Ligand binder design. Structure first.
Ligand code: NAG
Ligand code: NAG
Ligand code: NAG
Ligand code: NAG
Ligand code: NAG
Ligand code: NAG
Ligand code: NAG
Ligand code: NAG
Ligand code: NAG
Ligand code: NAG
Lengths: 362, 362
């Protein structure tokens, strides 16, 4: 008899892991009512209430951000986080607005997922401070009346006078047992032409460089609307310079350290949103794209009648996450199956394992 | 009885195409002896003797380059070219050497394959010239005694005096029937610190920019070994500027125009090399990576005892290309199969279609 895939994430061997927020964090005081996964699976997730891998990339604890040192290893990976940076947050640093932050978010998650498919371990690490320097200020946001906290990573600095300056930073090749064969590192900038301070409109730009790497940004057009934009870079371990065009410089203070596995396996991501009385975004659906990521979308709103509150304990995702309880043979966008000859519907890519073939063909 | 995959490329529907060189070019005077594909399949390939998609990206006809206006459409794609730019060519423009060109080649093919998996049609097009400008020279190579021809795409220019200048170029949204929903466009530069001309060491750099795009390069370090390096960019149709830091500017003159299909299908690439008495490279194997490309490597040298000459008519690839004669149900790194329940060996990803499962599991 042909088998019907269980819509939702799955795993074909015990070497699998998850990344999450409150909805997979057994440390939460409302556990198990606040969970969207089975409680027996919490030990498989690296998760913290209030956090997301995007938040933790850019911010330390404070000014409204709950940061977490995410760290896990698995050939197979399930991501269920992202919601803790949605338009609901009402954050802007310059004039990019909420949608500017949805764009940064898509950028981050797109790079994370594609890199994670080539990796087994993923670990947020702190970088050593750069070679010392002088006569500078840290950057601030003008957004939200100056209350918006600019990222701690990368760290922007502004020199007291126009200067020539290159400072050195290091991406390590390991972190307490994990090999960092590559790093996900942010590079952010403020576009919109020259940047006005105390009556002088300065060229804005800087770059990362080494003998085998370059990435930079520069503008000196007429001043217009300014936007804080981030690029997410894959960088090898080693020594780099951050270099100024005169007034501005950034250096990274954190990275996601990843190792490399030789067989690429698509990651899985589940739609991470709020209930309908808050502004969510579709950043996860935009970032989780074939062929590197298998997206399990919600077809209903986030509804938690048996949960801790209206934003924690969704029935649909709960049902989806029942899939992680079985030892499957096949993982696909249609969901998971045990070993079987025939499927009740066509299984498409991206998939992996041993997948049943659509019965009507035979 | 379990089926054995035919090692080599394949197709599951008639909507498939190929891209090639002499070894799939029925216009060649030694046809069919010079072919590595069956002759009945020539009408499925966009191919020219002496060319490659990498050559055609950068050069017009002449100075030793045979350029071709590659153009084809297929949900499924087989690439069999690349060899016509190997270290055998002995080309350098600055001091990057042959390996510098292997690196550019990997860059190009990596971007081409990944983009092509999201596209159906791929077409080399000529761009309109940029908005006019004055008091300039075209760049030249110092390599090979000044005999090395610098790419026609992108076109480097050097201004008579330090200047401020932004010029406009256009990536069109169509090309005679094909929708150009995206473009593969090169951006190349010369690294190694400031660039010495007539006693003055100039900062080297420039950028492409629009309100929704930036990509740039800049150096002003002490002069060292200079290398001509290329980045291969995915760009939306529309209007852009090329902008100088003072002395140098590039603008693109060609792109690969691609449309978009909504279901991503991995492309297939076959190892394109010379016989053992010439220097080949493994750029295709480095660029054709899971999950966007299925690489069929040669396990033997290029040997053509029944071919037109020692570089045309390989037995191994000939056998591989027999796969394209059948209407298969499954395409994989193990090769192609018709519809079947069971396989004699495990089928791995990337694959697509309906694939038999490994018999020993049942
Ligand atoms: C943030 O603070 C909490 C305690 O409130 C702690 O559990 C967590 O580890 C802190 N985050 C980081 C990144 O150190
Ligand atoms: C953000 O603004 C929206 C729209 O005004 C508001 O409804 C929402 O509660 C605000 N978010 C926070 C965290 O206060
Ligand atoms: C800038 O930020 C760093 C990292 O947050 C901090 O330790 C340092 O004290 C700040 N420097 C200045 C000059 O405010
Ligand atoms: C940047 O732009 C300003 C204002 O147009 C101009 O006067 C200045 O020369 C520019 N600076 C550089 C380094 O190009
Ligand atoms: C996911 O689902 C919602 C509505 O159910 C839809 O609006 C959104 O576009 C979907 N996104 C993707 C990428 O499927
Ligand atoms: C190069 O020249 C040949 C004739 O020798 C011609 O077939 C080919 O189309 C030319 N290439 C281009 C790109 O026009
Ligand atoms: C390139 O140089 C190699 C090594 O010296 C030589 O054997 C080969 O024939 C040269 N290539 C060409 C096209 O002449
Ligand atoms: C530079 O190259 C273009 C394109 O090849 C050519 O048409 C033009 O005549 C050249 N300009 C100069 C000043 O040599
Ligand atoms: C570039 O470097 C030279 C030589 O070190 C220096 O004198 C010059 O001021 C620099 N130019 C700019 C625009 O920074
Ligand atoms: C392909 O084959 C050759 C030798 O048969 C080997 O040296 C090369 O590394 C191979 N490359 C890949 C990526 O498999």
């Amino acid at each position: 008899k042909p088998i019907t895939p269980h819509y939702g994430p799955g795993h074909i061997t015990p070497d699998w892991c998850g990344f999450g927020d409150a909805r997979s964090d057994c440390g939460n005081k409302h556990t198990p009512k606040s969970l969207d996964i089975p409680q027996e699976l919490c030990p498989k997730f690296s998760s913290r209430t209030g956090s997301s891998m995007f938040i933790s990339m850019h911010w330390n604890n404070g000014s409204g951000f709950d940061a977490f040192d995410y760290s896990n290893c698995g050939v197979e990976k399930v991501f269920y986080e992202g919601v803790n940076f949605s338009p609901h947050r009402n954050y802007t640093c310059y004039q990019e607005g909420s949608s500017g932050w949805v764009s940064n978010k898509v950028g981050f998650y797109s790079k994370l997922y594609s890199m994670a498919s080539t990796s087994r371990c993923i670990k947020l690490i702190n970088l050593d401070p750069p070679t010392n320097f002088t006569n500078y200020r840290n950057g601030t946001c003008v957004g939200n009346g100056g209350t918006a906290k600019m990222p701690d990573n990368p760290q922007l600095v502004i020199f007291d006078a126009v200067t020539k300056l290159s400072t050195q930073f290091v991406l390590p090749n390991s972190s307490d047992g994990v090999s960092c064969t590559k790093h996900l590192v942010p590079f952010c900038y403020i576009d919109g032409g020259c940047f006005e301070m105390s009556g002088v409109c300065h060229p804005f730009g800087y770059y990362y460089e080494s003998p085998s790497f370059y990435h930079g940004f520069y503008t000196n057009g007429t001043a217009g609307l300014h936007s804080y934009i981030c690029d997410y870079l894959e960088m090898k371990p080693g020594v780099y310079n951050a270099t100024t065009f005169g007034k501005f410089l950034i250096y990274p203070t954190k990275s996601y350290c990843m190792d490399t596995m030789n067989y690429t396996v698509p990651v899985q991501a589940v739609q991470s949103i709020w209930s309908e009385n808050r502004q969510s975004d579709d950043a996860i659906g935009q970032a989780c794209k074939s062929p590197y990521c298998i997206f399990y979308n919600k077809t209903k709103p986030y509804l938690a009648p048996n949960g801790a509150d209206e934003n924690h304990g969704d029935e649909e995702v709960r049902q989806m996450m029942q899939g992680l309880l079985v030892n499957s043979s096949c993982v696909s966008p249609q969901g998971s199956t045990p070993l079987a000859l025939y499927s009740s519907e066509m299984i498409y890519i991206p998939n992996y394992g041993s997948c049943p073939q659509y019965y009507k063909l035979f």
